[PDB]
Amino acid sequence: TCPFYKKIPGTGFTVDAFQYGVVEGCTAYFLTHFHSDHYAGLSKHFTFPVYCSEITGNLLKNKLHVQEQYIHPLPLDTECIVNGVKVVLLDANHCPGAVMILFYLPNGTVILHTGDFRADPSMERSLLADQKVHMLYLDTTYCSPEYTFPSQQEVIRFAINTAFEAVTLNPHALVVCGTYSIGKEKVFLAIADVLGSKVGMSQEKYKTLQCLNIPEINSLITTDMCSSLVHLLPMMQINFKGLQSHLKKCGGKYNQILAFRPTGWTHSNKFTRIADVIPQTKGNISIYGIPYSEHSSYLEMKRFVQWLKPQKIIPTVNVGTWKSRSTMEKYFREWKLEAGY
Ligand code: NI
């Protein structure tokens, strides 16, 4: 049964609530982004309206085979009307197509739903800057001071060079990149841009990136693995038994795999800095874990909320233990006392 934190009071609306059958009183279902925890329950046999970004709507049509008549895409940064209620979609800085939703309730209340997001100062000069917010449905995926990780530009700086060094020394070395969903497209588009290669991947994965509206995507990706030296592989496959296995299927073309597993947070971020990162080696196979987060760090979140000054906050993530819920309100209170709202 749908939790309270996936319902927008005063509307017929829900957010990323597709796995509970038909919700009672829901006239519109909002999907924030195309990650399976959020769209779980959608298929070609869904028959209620779906609202989402243009890009998320490509993925529903093509990957899930949801019917064109139920998908309502909306432009970003644009004041839209939806069953008489003003809504705005803003970019979440999460994965491609991912939005935050502003709801302007008839009664005069205003509600921001972050979705999954990575807080950025650029968000402080968006449509949010002009008015007050009463309820914040917040992505608390990293709501604890231990959660520090570097900026995305830093990780992509390291990733390029680490890769670009390896192949200028040994031009018969492969660059694999691990993936299971959307998101994290820079990691691989960046490395492959520098090396000169298109990115090679499966037909399935090739179908997925074709939906994301990337400029000139044709020029950047291929299914032709023989004609590619920056490959993509399922994240599960990025171990020693899986990379070996793949190294055979190259057919005498590459004599070394230099992988990347983009991870979110890992307890090694609490101690080791990004520039000091190294690989797990078992011969010619070197697997890099790098901290590429598509979620806010503790300080990014804090700054975002202390700017927004919302009257009530509602965590959408790590809600399932009284220890996590307990710990989160303490930070929210400290943030409110610090900033004097
Ligand atoms: Ni997500």
Which residue intervals of 78-184 are DSSP H helices? 152-169
Rounded to the nearest whole angstrom, what is the distance from the C-alpha of residue 142 to the centroid of ligand 1?
A: 13
Backbone phi, psi, residue 121, to 5°: -60, -25
- Identify the structural domains of the chain with CATH numbers, from first to last: 1-147+296-341 (3.60.15.10), 148-295 (3.40.50.12650)
Could you tell me the maximum CA-CA distance found in the chain, to the nearest angstrom?
A: 68
Rounded to the nearest whole angstrom, what is the distance from the C-alpha of residue 139 to the centroid of ligand 1?
A: 10
Contact assessment for residue 208 and residue 184, using Cβ atoms and an 8 Å cutoff: no
Rounded to the nearest whole angstrom, what is the distance from the C-alpha of residue 318 to the centroid of ligand 1?
A: 14
Chain centroid to Cα 159, Å, comes to: 19
Rounded to the nearest whole angstrom, what is the distance from the C-alpha of residue 48 to the centroid of ligand 1?
A: 23
Torsion 161-164-168-174 (CA) sign = positive
Rounded to the nearest whole angstrom, what is the distance from the C-alpha of residue 34 to the centroid of ligand 1?
A: 7
Rounded to the nearest whole angstrom, what is the distance from the C-alpha of residue 263 to the centroid of ligand 1?
A: 13
Rounded to the nearest whole angstrom, what is the distance from the C-alpha of residue 292 to the centroid of ligand 1?
A: 13
Rounded to the nearest whole angstrom, what is the distance from the C-alpha of residue 179 to the centroid of ligand 1?
A: 13
Rounded to the nearest whole angstrom, what is the distance from the C-alpha of residue 94 to the centroid of ligand 1?
A: 7
Q: How many beta carbons lie within 10 A of that of residue 340, not counting itself?
A: 7
Rounded to the nearest whole angstrom, what is the distance from the C-alpha of residue 117 to the centroid of ligand 1?
A: 8
Contact assessment for residue 116 and residue 33, using Cβ atoms and an 8 Å cutoff: yes
Name the burial class of residue 263, with classes exposed (0-12), middle (13-18) and buried (19+) by CB atoms within 10 angstroms of its CB: middle
